[PDB]
């Protein structure tokens, strides 16, 4: 509705920081979206990847995110990167959003753009043997000002300690920009 052109008025009252924190606290968002699966019986593995274009993927082996209706009517892949920390307001705060699940014998996908604004429905893309979601999205340089660009070692951190606190999950981290390119895995 108009949640999420509020997310882009205020975005310090929903991520903690309109800074480099903030930028960091999106990420951290979608990769305790994937957590939320681990400790719900399902996946043990997480990639993060920092690509050429500045905007990060998330990738997990949980079941996928459900695709049938939301109690609002609405599709629920829909509801949860719309509806208001929450995958909504990453999206408010990304000048794009994409969402992958490999669910059921099927690969799905959504598009989102511009603050969070559907670009397509759930579409049917292909089929697979593979189980869970990938969410890739872009932050909006109109919100972080200053920079969007991500920092290796302040994710690896994070990650690390997530790997530590959760156990028998394997994190690895990986960046593909140009001249900065690094691999690294967690598990504990
Ligand atoms: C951003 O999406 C997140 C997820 O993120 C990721 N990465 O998976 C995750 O954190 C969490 O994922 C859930 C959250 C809830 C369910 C969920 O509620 C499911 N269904 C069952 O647990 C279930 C278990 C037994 C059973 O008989 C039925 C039948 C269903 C009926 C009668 C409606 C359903 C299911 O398959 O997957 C679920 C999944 C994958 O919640 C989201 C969707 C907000």
Redesign the pocket.
């Known amino acids: 509705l108009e949640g999420l052109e509020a997310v882009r008025k205020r975005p310090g009252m929903y991520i903690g920081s309109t800074d480099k924190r903030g930028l960091h606290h999106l990420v951290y968002e979608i990769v305790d979206?994937?957590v939320?699966?681990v400790l719900?019986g399902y996946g043990n593995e997480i990639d993060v990847t920092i690509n050429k274009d500045g905007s990060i993927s998330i990738e997990?082996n949980?079941?996928?995110?459900?695709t049938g209706i939301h109690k609002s009517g609405k599709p629920?892949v829909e509801v949860?990167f719309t509806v208001l920390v929450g995958?909504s307001v990453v999206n408010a705060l990304s000048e794009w959003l994409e969402v992958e699940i490999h669910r059921d014998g099927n690969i799905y996908h959504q598009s989102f753009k511009n603050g969070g604004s559907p670009s397509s429905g759930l579409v049917k893309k292909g089929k697979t043997k593979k189980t869970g979601?990938k969410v890739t999205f872009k932050p909006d340089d109109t919100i972080f000002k200053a920079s969007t660009s991500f920092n290796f070692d302040v994710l690896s951190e994070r990650l690390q300690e997530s790997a530590f606190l959760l156990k028998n999950l394997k994190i690895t981290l990986n960046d593909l920009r140009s001249g900065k390119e690094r691999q690294e895995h967690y598990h504990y």
């Open positions: 979206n994937s939320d699966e719900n997990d949980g079941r996928g995110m459900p629920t949860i995958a979601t």
